[PDB]
Structure 1
Amino acid sequence: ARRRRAEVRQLQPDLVYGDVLVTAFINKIMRDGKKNLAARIFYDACKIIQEKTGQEPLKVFKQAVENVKPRMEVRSRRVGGANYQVPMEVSPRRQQSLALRWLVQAANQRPERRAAVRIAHELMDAAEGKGGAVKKKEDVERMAEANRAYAHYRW
């Protein structure tokens, strides 16, 4: 907005692992405000991921996000008769916002049939380093570096 710096909504940490991060993800899961539904497919996916990976999946998705955290994206700046994909040091709040938006985005991409299935499977790969979830980031951070000629136009 035009006034001052907007505020950051601090969420109510989840009721299972005691984390606000978890509380954040279910939201993206949560469609039509169906928290119970969303809260399920998550802790459900948290089950399949456990069975196929016997390490506390809390850490799993604690990892698979940093792997998703993009460090540099591009943003279009149209100085004069042209718009420049001026890349900028992505912001923290946004990075979580960015990582929190393709896993599901890439999970919903996934072909397997059940919700908790997909959501989980995207959780693992990023913990390893595989999947379109890492794709966006990967593609994003290098187009920027593929445009490192505009950093002086930064902001």
Structure 2
Amino acid sequence: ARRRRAEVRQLQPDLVYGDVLVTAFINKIMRDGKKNLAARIFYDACKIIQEKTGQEPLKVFKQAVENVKPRMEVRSRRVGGANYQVPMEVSPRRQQSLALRWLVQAANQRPERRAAVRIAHELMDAAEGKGGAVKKKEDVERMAEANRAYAHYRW
């Protein structure tokens, strides 16, 4: 990215909810270009969301993903010869991409057999503010403050 700045790739909305967020989230589930399988596993969980709670999977997804949005992180700025781990803002772009990634990463971490059953639970506990995906969030935020001293390097 030494030249321009790179265009944040655009994305066709959901073939269902019409949500771009869901479109992206699917890609994270997607294994080896098999997009079909990914969507399937997602929607299967989507309905499972209601099967458990009288709530629709819509806001369950937003509520969840919004609780896994890390407010601030630690970037290692190697200035002054040494590599200081400075705490600073998370670009709105990152908060999303990271959340979704952690979401699915923590989801795969779950033990249960079927994959869609993991995306469901992880999604629920996430909106509930309790999931293991949230645990990575609570960490990165604390890891940021455990070094608030060097924050005077915030570029």
TM-score interval (norm. to shorter): over 0.9
User: Per-residue displacement from partner, 1:11-48 (whole Å, max 9, x unpaired)?
Assistant: 10011101111100000011111111000000001111
Percent of pairs with identical residues:
100
Instruction: Please name the residue that 1:123 is paired with.
Output: 123
Instruction: Give me the CA root mean square deviation.
Output: 0.9
CA distance in 2, matches of 1:54, 1:102: 26
| Structure 2 residues without counterparts, runs of 5 or longer | none
> Is 1:14 aligned to residue 24 of structure 2?
no
1:81 CA displacement: 4.1
Helix, strand or coil: the match of 1:86?
strand
CA distance in 1, matches of 2:119, 2:56: 16
TM-score by length of 2: 0.96
TM-score by length of 1: 0.96
- Assess if the C-alpha contact under 8 Å between 2:26 and 2:38 holds in 1: yes
Moved more, 144-153 or 103-112: 144-153
Moved more, 2-11 or 22-31: 2-11
1:79 CA displacement: 2.3
Runs of 4 or more, structure 1, over 4 Å off, are none
- Assess if the C-alpha contact under 8 Å between 2:76 and 2:86 holds in 1: yes
Instruction: Please name the residue that 2:82 is paired with.
Output: 82
